[PDB]
Design an enzyme around this catalytic site. Structure first.
Site, PDB file in Angstrom:
ATOM      1  N   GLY A  46       0.820  -1.220   0.000  1.00 34.78           N
ATOM      2  CA  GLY A  46       0.000   0.000   0.000  1.00 34.78           C
ATOM      3  C   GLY A  46       0.847   1.260   0.000  1.00 34.78           C
ATOM      4  CB  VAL A  47       4.383   1.841  -0.312  1.00 33.59           C
ATOM      5  CG1 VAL A  47       5.405   2.873  -0.742  1.00 33.59           C
ATOM      6  CG2 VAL A  47       4.457   1.603   1.195  1.00 33.59           C
ATOM      7  CB  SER A 116      -6.930  -0.820 -10.032  1.00 28.10           C
ATOM      8  OG  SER A 116      -6.234  -1.248 -11.190  1.00 28.10           O
ATOM      9  CE  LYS A 117      -4.925   6.587 -13.810  1.00 25.78           C
ATOM     10  NZ  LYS A 117      -6.131   6.943 -14.653  1.00 25.78           N
ATOM     11  CG  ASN A 118      -3.950  -0.987 -15.141  1.00 27.58           C
ATOM     12  OD1 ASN A 118      -3.104  -0.906 -14.267  1.00 27.58           O
ATOM     13  ND2 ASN A 118      -3.775  -0.483 -16.396  1.00 27.58           N
ATOM     14  CE  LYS A 145     -10.245   2.241  -2.013  1.00 27.82           C
ATOM     15  NZ  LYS A 145     -10.346   0.801  -2.346  1.00 27.82           N
ATOM     16  CD  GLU A 169     -10.782  -1.510   0.639  1.00 36.11           C
ATOM     17  OE1 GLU A 169      -9.866  -2.302   0.980  1.00 36.11           O
ATOM     18  OE2 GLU A 169     -10.630  -0.595  -0.202  1.00 36.11           O
TER      19      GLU A 169
HETATM   20  F1  ALF Z   1      -8.149  -2.174  -5.348  1.00 31.40           F
HETATM   21 AL1  ALF Z   1      -7.874  -1.389  -3.701  1.00 31.40          AL
HETATM   22  F2  ALF Z   1      -7.595  -0.632  -2.072  1.00 31.40           F
HETATM   23  F3  ALF Z   1      -8.454   0.177  -4.370  1.00 31.40           F
HETATM   24  F4  ALF Z   1      -7.268  -2.949  -3.020  1.00 31.40           F
HETATM   25 MG   LIG Z   2      -7.680  -4.074  -1.312  1.00 27.93          MG
END
Ligand code: ALF
Ligand SMILES: [Mg+2]
Length: 219
Positions: A46-47, A116-118, A145, A169
């Site tokens: 998450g970096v 995700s941009k994809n 987030k 999530e």
């Molecule tokens: F796809 Al995410 F936090 F936006 F795991």
């Molecule tokens: Mg996630």
């Protein structure tokens, strides 16, 4: 009954994290920096891409211009995009396809709330596009987030208020985003990472319509 389910992508619908890891490994190898293994990859959790790149340069105390930095980040992303061409319907996590089908047949709205941009690409590779009523575009939100922007955008895109929605999530920051949107979070993972004031399931096979209904009712 809840009117919408807002889905994060990574760690809920599918895993991208391995492709990311391998993109960084290839980049590190190409530029001659040792130390980019699975263990080190924990520190890329998450970096952001730029921060991850920085941690890698730091392994060899390497200094670069802004332009070189930018080019290296671009190359990692090029690798990543190349590697995700082989994502397939078999990479859909357990339980998820059935949940999507049950939600749709009960006329419950489905939205992607992913950074995700994809996103659209990956949903298409997994043959999931037809189940989604909306994809909130991460390029159009002010703040990621744990800010709730993305979950708010997702709900609104399907014609609902966040308070009529469940959010799914696998990250603390995502759980916090869902809370602050006003949606009801159900996490997947462990309370160590997620907190223990929200409902959590051990893996995605526990995400069923029946279970989501249970949670909504007891709330
Ligand atoms: F796809 Al995410 F936090 F936006 F795991
Ligand atoms: Mg996630």
């Amino acid at each position: 009954m809840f009117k919408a389910v807002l889905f994060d992508l990574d760690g809920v619908i599918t895993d991208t994290a391995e492709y990311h890891f391998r993109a960084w490994k290839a980049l590190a190898e190409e530029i001659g920096i040792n130390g980019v293994d699975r263990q080190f990859n924990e520190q890329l959790k998450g970096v952001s891409r730029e921060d991850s790149l920085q941690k890698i340069l730091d392994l060899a105390d390497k200094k670069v211009s802004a332009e070189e930095f930018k080019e290296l980040a671009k190359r990692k992303n090029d690798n990543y995009v190349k590697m995700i061409q082989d994502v397939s319907p078999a990479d859909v996590y357990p339980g998820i396809l059935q949940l999507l089908k049950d939600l749709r047949s009960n006329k419950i709205k489905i939205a992607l709330a992913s950074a995700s941009k994809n996103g659209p690409f990956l949903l298409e590779r997994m043959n999931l596009t037809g189940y989604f009523d909306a994809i909130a575009d991460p390029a159009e939100v002010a703040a990621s987030k744990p800010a709730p922007d993305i979950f708010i955008a997702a709900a609104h895109a399907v014609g609902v208020a966040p308070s009529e929605s469940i959010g799914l999530e696998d990250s603390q920051a995502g759980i916090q985003a869902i809370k602050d949107s006003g949606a009801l979070p159900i996490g997947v993972g462990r309370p160590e990472d997620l907190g223990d004031d929200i409902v959590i399931v051990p893996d995605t096979s526990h995400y069923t319509l029946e279970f989501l209904k249970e949670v909504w009712l007891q709330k």
